[PDB]
Design an enzyme around this catalytic site. Structure first.
Site, PDB file in Angstrom:
ATOM      1  N   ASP A 249     -20.293 109.221  23.980  1.00  0.00           N
ATOM      2  CA  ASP A 249     -20.869 109.465  25.297  1.00  0.00           C
ATOM      3  C   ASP A 249     -21.654 108.217  25.698  1.00  0.00           C
ATOM      4  OD1 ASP A 249     -21.432 110.758  27.686  1.00  0.00           O
ATOM      5  OD2 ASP A 249     -22.753 112.282  26.822  1.00  0.00           O
TER       6      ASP A 249
ATOM      7  N   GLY B  62     -25.046  99.320  32.521  1.00  0.00           N
ATOM      8  CA  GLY B  62     -24.860  97.887  32.698  1.00  0.00           C
ATOM      9  C   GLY B  62     -23.477  97.411  32.300  1.00  0.00           C
ATOM     10  N   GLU B  63     -23.377  96.716  31.149  1.00  0.00           N
ATOM     11  CA  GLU B  63     -22.110  96.174  30.640  1.00  0.00           C
ATOM     12  C   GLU B  63     -21.804  96.586  29.193  1.00  0.00           C
ATOM     13  OE1 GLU B  63     -24.199  93.221  32.347  1.00  0.00           O
ATOM     14  OE2 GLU B  63     -23.456  94.448  34.020  1.00  0.00           O
ATOM     15  N   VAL B  64     -20.504  96.604  28.838  1.00  0.00           N
ATOM     16  CA  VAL B  64     -19.995  96.896  27.495  1.00  0.00           C
ATOM     17  C   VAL B  64     -19.319  95.607  26.985  1.00  0.00           C
ATOM     18  CG1 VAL B  64     -18.446  98.333  26.071  1.00  0.00           C
ATOM     19  CG2 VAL B  64     -19.760  99.395  27.925  1.00  0.00           C
TER      20      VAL B  64
ATOM     21  N   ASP C 222     -19.909 116.621  28.288  1.00  0.00           N
ATOM     22  CA  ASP C 222     -18.945 115.704  28.882  1.00  0.00           C
ATOM     23  C   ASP C 222     -17.789 115.379  27.951  1.00  0.00           C
ATOM     24  OD1 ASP C 222     -17.753 114.136  30.832  1.00  0.00           O
ATOM     25  OD2 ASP C 222     -19.217 112.540  30.758  1.00  0.00           O
TER      26      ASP C 222
ATOM     27  N   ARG D   6     -11.683 110.335  27.804  1.00  0.00           N
ATOM     28  CA  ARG D   6     -12.330 109.059  28.162  1.00  0.00           C
ATOM     29  C   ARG D   6     -13.602 108.798  27.320  1.00  0.00           C
ATOM     30  NH1 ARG D   6     -12.966 112.627  32.266  1.00  0.00           N
ATOM     31  NH2 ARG D   6     -15.080 113.492  32.291  1.00  0.00           N
ATOM     32  N   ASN D   7     -14.177 109.849  26.704  1.00  0.00           N
ATOM     33  CA  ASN D   7     -15.386 109.778  25.868  1.00  0.00           C
ATOM     34  C   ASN D   7     -15.074 109.886  24.367  1.00  0.00           C
ATOM     35  OD1 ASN D   7     -17.335 109.346  27.923  1.00  0.00           O
ATOM     36  ND2 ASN D   7     -17.416 111.497  28.397  1.00  0.00           N
TER      37      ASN D   7
ATOM     38  N   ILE E  12     -16.085  93.307  27.831  1.00  0.00           N
ATOM     39  CA  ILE E  12     -15.013  94.306  27.953  1.00  0.00           C
ATOM     40  C   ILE E  12     -14.979  94.929  29.361  1.00  0.00           C
ATOM     41  CG2 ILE E  12     -13.917  96.396  26.965  1.00  0.00           C
ATOM     42  CD1 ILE E  12     -15.682  95.607  24.289  1.00  0.00           C
ATOM     43  N   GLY E  13     -16.124  95.438  29.819  1.00  0.00           N
ATOM     44  CA  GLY E  13     -16.258  96.070  31.129  1.00  0.00           C
ATOM     45  C   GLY E  13     -17.667  96.077  31.690  1.00  0.00           C
ATOM     46  N   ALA E  14     -17.823  96.625  32.911  1.00  0.00           N
ATOM     47  CA  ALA E  14     -19.107  96.721  33.607  1.00  0.00           C
ATOM     48  C   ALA E  14     -19.459  98.170  33.956  1.00  0.00           C
ATOM     49  CB  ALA E  14     -19.088  95.865  34.864  1.00  0.00           C
TER      50      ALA E  14
HETATM   51  C1  LIG Z   1     -11.838  98.764  22.789  1.00  0.00           C
HETATM   52  C2  LIG Z   1     -12.861  99.038  23.869  1.00  0.00           C
HETATM   53  O1  LIG Z   1     -12.619  98.758  25.030  1.00  0.00           O
HETATM   54  C3  LIG Z   1     -14.159  99.669  23.478  1.00  0.00           C
HETATM   55  C4  LIG Z   1     -14.990 100.055  24.536  1.00  0.00           C
HETATM   56  C5  LIG Z   1     -16.201 100.633  24.302  1.00  0.00           C
HETATM   57  C6  LIG Z   1     -16.651 100.887  22.983  1.00  0.00           C
HETATM   58  C7  LIG Z   1     -17.912 101.490  22.614  1.00  0.00           C
HETATM   59  N1  LIG Z   1     -18.782 101.887  23.582  1.00  0.00           N
HETATM   60  C8  LIG Z   1     -20.112 102.332  23.468  1.00  0.00           C
HETATM   61  C9  LIG Z   1     -21.136 101.432  23.187  1.00  0.00           C
HETATM   62  C10 LIG Z   1     -22.444 101.879  23.096  1.00  0.00           C
HETATM   63  C11 LIG Z   1     -22.742 103.215  23.294  1.00  0.00           C
HETATM   64  C12 LIG Z   1     -21.727 104.109  23.576  1.00  0.00           C
HETATM   65  C13 LIG Z   1     -20.415 103.674  23.671  1.00  0.00           C
HETATM   66  N2  LIG Z   1     -18.250 101.670  21.330  1.00  0.00           N
HETATM   67  C14 LIG Z   1     -17.360 101.268  20.411  1.00  0.00           C
HETATM   68  N3  LIG Z   1     -16.167 100.700  20.596  1.00  0.00           N
HETATM   69  C15 LIG Z   1     -15.813 100.507  21.905  1.00  0.00           C
HETATM   70  C16 LIG Z   1     -14.565  99.904  22.181  1.00  0.00           C
END
Ligand SMILES: *CC(=O)c1ccc2c(Nc3ccccc3)ncnc2c1
Length: 267
Positions: free
Chosen positions: A142, A11-13, A124, A128-129, A8-10
């Site tokens: 967060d 560690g990394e998600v 925070d 965005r959170n 999804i994005g950049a």
């Molecule tokens: C739909 C999408 O882009 C997205 C992005 C991030 C998510 C997260 N992030 C996260 C992972 C671990 C710890 C904290 C936040 N979690 C759940 N869904 C998404 C979806």
């Protein structure tokens, strides 16, 4: 047990699947740490995983699991289909009723009420959170995934980064972070929601924001925002932190508006 699907994005998600012996397979979001992780960075990442694990509420992101035995280390959460609240609203500009936007804000306030009850100060709170699922349920998050780097969202401030546009004046000035300073941030979240993800304070520089707030400037009501909602934002932004409503009172006020929808017509 953990199977990856897409980045999804950049560690990394990343997005993936998870299967545990006793429960059915569910889609998950995987937060990974960049290659060649340091002892301090690994300790900081796991201390964030430990915080998320303490909570269980329908408006708080659910932690599915954590990978510790094998490198890279992972943080597994329930996949939220509509991703971050701010990006979700900008592309859905004017596509929701006031009642739906109020329901979203009620969910965020219910999550924040739960955190304040657990004696946890978020620090925070921002759109965005906040993560959104397919059923439009908003969940406080967060430690996850920039309009102008000249006026950055976070300012590198001595002890730690501070998001000036979302932070209470006493928390910027004296690091007085409390549930009342989270209420100020919540007021900014209300403004972000009712404006479909506009940038708080627009063109004003970060320093202008601090100066204006100190001189009693407050964000104007967004286009078509009901007066009752704006008044609630103004209550969240009282300079006297003791006069700001508690999250329980915000939940009560939003429920009162849901019960009396005529009050959401007055602009
Ligand atoms: C739909 C999408 O882009 C997205 C992005 C991030 C998510 C997260 N992030 C996260 C992972 C671990 C710890 C904290 C936040 N979690 C759940 N869904 C998404 C979806």
């Amino acid at each position: 047990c953990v199977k990856i699907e897409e980045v999804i994005g950049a560690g990394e998600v990343c997005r993936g699947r998870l299967k545990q012996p006793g429960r059915r397979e569910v889609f998950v979001a995987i937060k990974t740490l960049k290659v060649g992780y340091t002892e301090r960075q690994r300790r900081d990442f796991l201390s964030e995983a430990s915080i998320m694990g303490q909570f269980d509420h329908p408006n708080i992101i659910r932690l599915e699991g954590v990978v510790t035995k094998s490198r890279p280390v992972m943080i597994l959460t329930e996949f939220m289909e509509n991703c971050a609240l701010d990006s979700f609203l900008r592309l859905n500009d004017g596509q929701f009723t006031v009642i739906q936007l109020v329901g979203m804000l009620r969910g965020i306030a219910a999550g924040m009420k739960y955190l304040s009850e657990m004696n946890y100060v978020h620090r925070d709170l921002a759109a965005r959170n906040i993560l959104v699922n397919s059923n439009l349920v908003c969940k406080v998050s967060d430690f996850g995934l920039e309009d102008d780097p000249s006026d950055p969202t976070y300012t590198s401030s001595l002890g730690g980064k501070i998001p000036i546009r979302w932070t209470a004046p006493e928390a910027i000035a004296y690091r007085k972070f409390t549930s009342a300073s989270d209420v100020w941030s919540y007021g900014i979240v209300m403004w972000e929601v009712m404006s479909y993800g506009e940038r708080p304070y627009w063109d004003m520089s970060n320093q202008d924001v601090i100066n204006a707030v100190e001189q009693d400037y407050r964000l104007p009501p967004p286009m078509d925002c009901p007066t009752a909602l704006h008044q609630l934002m103004l209550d969240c932004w009282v300079r006297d932190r003791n006069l700001r409503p508690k999250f329980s009172q915000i939940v009560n006020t939003l429920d009162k508006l849901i019960r009396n929808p005529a009050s959401l017509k007055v602009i």
